[PDB]
Amino acid sequence: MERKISRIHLVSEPSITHFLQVSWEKTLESGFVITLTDGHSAWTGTVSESEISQEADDMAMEKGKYVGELRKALLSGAGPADVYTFNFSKESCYFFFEKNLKDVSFRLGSFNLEKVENPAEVIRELICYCLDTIAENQA
Amino acid sequence: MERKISRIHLVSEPSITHFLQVSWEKTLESGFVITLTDGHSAWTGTVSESEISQEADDMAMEKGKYVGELRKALLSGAGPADVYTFNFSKESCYFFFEKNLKDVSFRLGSFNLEKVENPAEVIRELICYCLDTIAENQAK
Amino acid sequence: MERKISRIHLVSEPSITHFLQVSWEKTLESGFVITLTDGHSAWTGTVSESEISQEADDMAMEKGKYVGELRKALLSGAGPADVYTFNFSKESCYFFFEKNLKDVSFRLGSFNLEKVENPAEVIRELICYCLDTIAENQAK
Amino acid sequence: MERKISRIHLVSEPSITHFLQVSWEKTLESGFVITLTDGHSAWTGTVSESEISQEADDMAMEKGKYVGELRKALLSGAGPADVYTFNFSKESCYFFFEKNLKDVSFRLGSFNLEKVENPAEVIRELICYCLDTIAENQAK
């Protein structure tokens, strides 16, 4: 089982720097699960392989074009260029991320994030993940 | 400045493995800022070199061996033999640290804490921190 | 060698005026020999420096204050005030010289005296000493 | 009251140095009291003025010459030359002080003493007078 993490600036709160954890299996596109926290509360959603083939047909690029896309826009492997703006509303739970790469906007991303209950056990799960990780990586 | 952290198990809640950050200046002895959290809420406190050397006398040890204990204990650099147990009461903002091994249950320390107003704020703080590190530990 | 003598009142025979000779080396503290005689018989004893500092420590006075008091008690070098009082049992040798002052009786020392076998010789001795003493003293 | 003391070498005990004290009022011939001591026991005798004139006749010397001879004999005012020797018998009590000079036994002044009751008292007396004396002659 695989995963990664990083920060982003929501447009709704360019104040609070929210956080993102994306877990998969082998390749990003074997399907994946996503989680977005503010520190206090925590949200999360599912994403099949089916809905990604469908987003790649709904945009009009290859399955492998769109892929590199979320490879960067999301897993903090964006470019120098590549200017992303992310968008969530907790009255929505709907999360959608607006790629941007010139005036102005485009989009790309959009799926149902439902709100976990125990922000807490998450926040701790994450933190342990970074523990064992930072140690494993000074090893 | 300096920072290090650890994962504990307060004995009021063995299910919810809590977490402990210590931040000092040059050497822990200089005095330190400690903070303990569960995920939802966050608790903070100060322990100036004043009360460090103070307690170090109270326990009739070398002001050192003491701090060595606050190194195996409050910097998870614990020797795999000594067993420590922390405790806190949320209704009694006092955090007391018992050094342990072959109960009895000797002792070691204890100071009052508190709750900051933005447990979140802090949380985000440290998340940032460790990001910055493991990152500048995969560049290094 | 040196010497000095004085008259006393044994508190056993307050009518018969007994007499006390004391002879030493340099300072009275360098050890000394003592003599007490009534005219018929004669007693003598030896008190080394060892027991001067010994009794001086026993009382807890300095070696130099104890020597002062023993230069006011056994050398008739007593001021116009202090009321020393000596005590001797001609049966138990133990001559203890006590001080008395202001309703309180204490003491100051105590020694074991022998019984010389020739009181006469000793007497003719002291006497001769006195003779040469007033001859040479009217020679000055 | 008047007095004076000296030492003589008894002929029966040339090792033991005996002692002689003579007391009187004004002139030695006025009549005098004599006391001889060996240290333990004592002897006391009188010599009245009529036995002074008397013996002064028996010999045939003038009362002024004989008087010179006893003021040189029994008062240690002996010229460097004249050699007096004294004799006593604790058996007879007959004490004769004789003068010796040029290989002939001359003689002179005789008298009878007696062993007294309180030799101790006598000795204490002498020692006291000698104390008062030397004291008086350092005060002078």
């Binding site: - | - | 009382m59 807890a60 006075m61 008091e69 006590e98 001080k99 002052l101 202001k102 309703d103 309180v104 009786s105 204490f106 003491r107 100051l108 | -």
Partner: protein, 217 residues
């Protein structure tokens, strides 16, 4: 004997010092014996006594000596009358406090070893607490009479600065006395210091008249 206790309560407290430690105590002495009360502010110690033992331990140590006890108690009565002066040392073992007093007394040495037991509770009451409590409440009552007095003068110049229609030089124009705000300002600025035990010195210096007056009360 019993009177020793009466006079004992009749006496205020004072400060001392012996080999770094510095005790507090009260004492009473007549010719029979004495009554003593020493403490280091955690546990109190106490020894009452007569003639028998003052002569006994007035013996042990000080051998040579021989005297009537009423002389001893008088001696130390002079020593401690004006330490409140030779020297002292303090030993601590068991429930007890041994108090070593060293002094001359006209030449010859002489010193004593107070055998102190752990003070009787009832005593801790009679001497320590009740009296203290009383002092406290009294002081409070002084605070109230002073409150009403202050407000009274406030009434006088509140009749000079309105009803008289006059003004001031404003160099001595004081503030309307608020008891409450005064209580908080004092219990934030002045309280952290005004209630300083330390060694028991700020007590014997500022409150022996109140105490003495309240324990005879």
């Amino acid at each position: 004997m019993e009177e020793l206790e009466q006079g004992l309560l009749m006496q205020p407290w004072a400060w001392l010092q012996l080999a770094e430690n510095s005790l507090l105590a009260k004492v009473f002495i007549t010719k029979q014996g004495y009554a003593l009360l020493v403490s280091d502010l955690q546990q109190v110690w106490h020894e009452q006594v007569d003639t028998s033992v003052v002569s006994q331990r007035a013996k042990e140590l000080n051998k040579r000596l021989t005297a009537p006890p009423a002389a001893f108690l008088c001696h130390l009565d002079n020593l401690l009358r004006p330490l409140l002066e030779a020297t002292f040392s303090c030993d601590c073992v068991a429930d007890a406090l041994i108090l070593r007093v060293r002094s001359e007394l006209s030449g010859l040495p002489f010193y004593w070893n107070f055998h102190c037991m752990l003070a009787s509770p009832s005593l801790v009451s009679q001497h320590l607490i009740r009296p203290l409590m009383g002092m406290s409440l009294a002081l409070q009552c002084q605070v109230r009479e002073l409150a009403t007095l202050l407000h009274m003068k406030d009434l006088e110049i509140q009749d000079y600065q309105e009803s008289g229609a006059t003004l001031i030089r404003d160099r001595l124009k004081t503030e309307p006395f608020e008891e409450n705000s005064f209580l908080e300002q004092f219990m934030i600025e002045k309280l952290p210091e005004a209630c300083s035990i330390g060694d028991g010195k700020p007590f014997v210096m500022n409150l022996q008249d109140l105490y003495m007056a309240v324990t005879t009360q």
